[PDB]
Design a protein around this ligand. Structure first.
Ligand code: 06Q
Ligand code: 06Q
Lengths: 302, 302
């Protein structure tokens, strides 16, 4: 029993964190086989960030301008290239701790673990979701750039996020491991801001099923809803539209609990309309949306 | 910016998890140097649990009754002994991945990371606190016994919890790594239950300071309180008494924010008396008590 915001064990990713220095800028990199991946703004001064031309800035660098440190060992850079907003430093040593791994670009609403790191040294691990507005509500300080987000499946690490910057509302933006930003963001100082966000409906419904699995039913009711009428209420509360695909994905949890998906939707509609009236669900007084249907199945009893 | 329920990176503990089997009972063990630590009820059948005499049960076992598996390698047991409620199996191989480590018995209100494991295989990592009633609100299924809780300090792992059982309210009980239960619990099937719990006041106050550090001040007020009058209100709301030691411990956060501890107490008193009125703090609609003052300092900007 019990339900916690669980991250994946971080050891396979710990063995890949290094530190990268260019000039006076130091950040983290990800060392897989003989390549080190890090944010390309490692080559930037602070004045460069106003309007940088990274091709121009990078053509002025050589291999020896990059200092890569893995624990107490310096790693020699023997090539460098840029791919979108990530720099790839080829080093002369393949990481002996490289896990089986993939690079994946995730969809909004998907969750992943973040291994927060400073100076190539992991400091903590936590779970978060890619918001519908393509930010994440992380916990990141100065020096955390190059920290990565990942999922683990049967010993294969799927890396999905590398950290680049903090937006003015305190939420975070970054790229996939091929350097493409999530959302409209760019790596130059501009007036860019997080767009309006929405709640991830299919995740809220998964977490209500987690609550039932863990023995809590107080929020259920005898009603059902059509998908259309549910979405009318969802739109009103800044929830994402629920699709038939979402309903299909919630199939397995529905079957385990005996609660039809559209019946759980009628429950959520009632919770949105009346609030919780001083009650909690799984120890929360807010409707939680950072658990996917897959997360619930993985963590909960069958 | 940002504030997350952060666990320690789990890699150093991942390298220590093994599986232990006795008869038809399999659970997890902790392999450090040439010793494997696991719950002593690994030697029990289900009928043994009604009134077990573990000395009697253990005297009937030999080394070869214990099967220890580390990854794909069987580990040969060459001695066994019991220390309180933990069994110590001496194996013929020292774990080459043993971290620098300590065993610590923690106080209620302290937090730690849990590495949930099944069949010697880590499945997830999360943060929790030892409640005042000496339970933890974990996330544990069948097979999770022997999973451990830990803190990490400068590469030294301080193990503080090994998981033994789930109580009827769905909260969890276990021991330190020397086999002594937290709380009044025992490893035999009885009508034991979690006692009444309280909220960890010094932790709530730490988290209010985290909120201020992260730029949220809406709950502050111009008032102060005496420690005595605060504790009168705390007692009324099932909060733990706040001590002068707690106030001293909150010193550094007080100094960083410029908010005297007793002024933050007046803020908490106002929050307890009026509620939040639909507002949130650090993304929570409840007052959070699973962050110690040390956790806040570690995670937050200075
Ligand atoms: C990274 O660790 C990092 O890259 N530091 C090195 C660096 C900084 C500036 C120029 C070159 C190299 C930073 C992590 C941030 C730090 C703040 C707290 N939380 C974090 O996640 N990332 C940064 O410092 C970026 C650099 C950047 C600037 C512009 C851009 F388009 C892309 C990247 N800056 C910010 O994240 C940030 C937040 C903020 C608030 C107010 C004013 C400026 C500002 O920058
Ligand atoms: C462990 O993984 C474990 O040790 N399994 C092996 C085992 C079970 C029974 C007898 C001998 C060996 C279990 C983890 C629990 C499992 C349930 C879900 N969440 C968990 O954390 N621990 C157990 O199964 C204990 C065994 C035990 C029994 C009595 C005792 F005093 C101490 C330990 N049992 C329970 O945790 C538990 C919960 C529960 C509810 C209702 C009826 C019985 C019952 O037992």
């Amino acid at each position: 029993s019990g339900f916690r915001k669980m991250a994946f064990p971080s050891g396979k990713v710990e063995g890949c964190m290094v530190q990268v220095t260019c000039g006076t800028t130091t950040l983290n990199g990800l060392w897989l086989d003989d390549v080190v991946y890090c944010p390309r703004h490692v080559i930037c001064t602070s004045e460069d960030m106003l309007n940088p031309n990274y091709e121009d800035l990078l053509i002025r660098k050589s291999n020896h301008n990059f200092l890569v440190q893995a624990g107490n060992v310096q790693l020699r850079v023997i090539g460098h290239s840029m791919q979108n907003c990530v720099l790839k430093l080829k080093v002369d040593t393949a990481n002996p701790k490289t896990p089986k791994y993939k690079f994946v670009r995730i969809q909004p609403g998907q969750t992943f673990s973040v291994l927060a790191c400073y100076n190539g040294s992991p400091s903590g691990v936590y779970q978060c979701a890619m918001r519908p507005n393509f930010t994440i509500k992380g916990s990141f300080l100065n020096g955390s750039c190059g920290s990565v987000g990942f999922n683990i499946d049967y010993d294969c690490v799927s890396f999905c996020y590398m950290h680049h910057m903090e937006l003015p509302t305190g939420v975070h933006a970054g790229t996939d491991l091929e350097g493409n930003f999530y959302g409209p963001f760019v790596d130059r100082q501009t007036a860019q801001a997080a767009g309006t966000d929405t709640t991830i409906t299919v995740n809220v419904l998964a977490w209500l099923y987690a609550a039932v699995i863990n023995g809590d039913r107080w929020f259920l009711n005898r009603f059902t809803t059509t998908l259309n009428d549910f979405n009318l209420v969802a739109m009103k509360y800044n929830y994402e539209p629920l699709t038939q695909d979402h309903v299909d994905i919630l199939g397995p949890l529905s079957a385990q609990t005996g609660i039809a998906v559209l019946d759980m939707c009628a429950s959520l509609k009632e919770l949105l309309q009346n609030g919780m009236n001083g009650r909690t669900i799984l120890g929360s007084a807010l409707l939680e949306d950072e658990f996917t249907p897959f997360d619930v199945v993985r963590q909960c009893s069958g």
